[PDB]
Ligand binder design. Structure first.
Ligand SMILES: Cc1cc2nc3c(=O)[nH]c(=O)nc-3n(C[C@H](O)[C@H](O)[C@H](O)COP(=O)(O)O)c2cc1C
Length: 147
């Protein structure tokens, strides 16, 4: 199994999430390519991947904005090869904002509309990812089954 993890992270929380999930899937024997969304090109981005995991934190006060690096990729997602792709999504935010990890909800909606196959409900981390390290490792373990 070949996985691609793309993450948008401002303060490092989701990047630490994506590292932790990449180590879990590498430990289980998946090939893993993990990339900062700021370095990537939407063009056929997901071709050849058995599993694609997209991580993005949430910004904004009364509106949901996606993490700033991730926006460009999000806007071209139809250009990626997501139809039929087995995909899941994750992100850090904070339960005291009106839309808690609303970026994870906006990337899942867009992915579902594309015919993506979401194997697992989104990982939404409230607070510091280093405290929810346990739920991060189990979510990765669990996405390896939805497959
Ligand atoms: C100004 C501001 C606005 C934010 N808005 C939201 C939000 O609407 N929903 C949410 O769940 N978290 C929100 N957050 C929480 C951040 O997503 C959280 O701090 C996250 O740990 C950042 O992840 P990052 O380090 O990967 O970019 C906000 C944080 C700040 C400072």
């Amino acid at each position: 199994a070949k996985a691609l993890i793309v993450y948008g992270s401002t303060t490092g929380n989701t990047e630490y999430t994506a590292e932790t999930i990449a180590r879990e899937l590498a430990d289980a024997g998946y090939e893993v390519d993990c990339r900062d969304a700021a370095s990537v090109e939407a063009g056929g981005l997901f071709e050849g991947f058995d599993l694609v995991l997209l991580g993005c934190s949430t910004w904004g006060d009364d509106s949901i904005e996606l993490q700033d690096d991730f926006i460009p990729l999000f806007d071209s997602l139809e250009e990626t090869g997501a139809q039929g792709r087995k995909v899941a999504c994750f992100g850090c935010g904070d339960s005291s904002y009106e839309y808690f990890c609303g970026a994870v909800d906006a990337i899942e909606e867009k992915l579902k509309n594309l015919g993506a196959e979401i194997v697992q409900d989104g990982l939404r981390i409230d607070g510091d990812p280093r405290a929810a390290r346990d739920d991060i490792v189990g979510w990765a373990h669990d996405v390896r089954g939805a497959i």
